[PDB]
């Protein structure tokens, strides 16, 4: 349960190579000006498949 030897900086970086986070799947809003996630209401525009959401 105890690490026998220290992990070197090379093995540390090789384990951390899969620890990235990807870019969010993003789409330009049809009501324009801002950039949105897919299948989500735009925060600035307040629109989803046209028209307002109030």
């Amino acid at each position: 349960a105890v690490p026998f030897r220290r992990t070197s900086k090379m093995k540390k970086r090789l384990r951390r190579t899969h620890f990235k986070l990807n870019v969010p799947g993003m789409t330009e809003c049809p009501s324009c000006g801002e950039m949105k996630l897919s299948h989500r209401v735009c925060k600035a525009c307040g629109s989803y498949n046209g028209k307002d959401i109030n």
Binding site: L37, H39, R40, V41, K43, Y48, I53
Partner: peptide, 9 residues
């Protein structure tokens, strides 16, 4: 189909 689900951030 009486309901709508709209995702937010």
């Amino acid at each position: 189909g009486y309901t709508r689900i709209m995702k937010l951030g």
